[PDB]
Design a protein around this motif. Sequence first.
Motif: not given
Length: 130
Positions: A118, A115, A34, A68, A17, A70, A39
């Motif tokens: 993304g 992640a 991302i 996305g 990132t 997470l 991470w």
Amino acid sequence: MVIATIQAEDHSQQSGTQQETTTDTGGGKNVGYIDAGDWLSYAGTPVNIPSSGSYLIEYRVASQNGGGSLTFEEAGGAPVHGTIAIPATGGWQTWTTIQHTVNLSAGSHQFGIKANAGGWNLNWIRINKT
Ligand SMILES: [Ca+2]
Ligand SMILES: [Ca+2]
């Protein structure tokens, strides 16, 4: 009340990132670029959980196209606390706060975010009592 607010860019380690300026309320920076596998580790700033039980985790997010997701966990990958889908918000700097609950054990925690997919930016995370 609030246990901790962690600015997303205030990670002690990361993978994949990059920081960028945010126009969200309060300004400063967000994490961007991302993708799956990327991470963020907050191991350098342990957070104290006063009692075992349910906590509400909030994420300040922006996403052009959605899709996305997470995983919220301890730094290093385990144990995993929870997962959350990140919705489309209208744009890369159109911000909203999403939330879920997780169980946390009492004591000092070193948190991390992985992640799984993304397509989103992250400004900050907040841990709250229920
Ligand atoms: Ca990336
Ligand atoms: Ca931020």
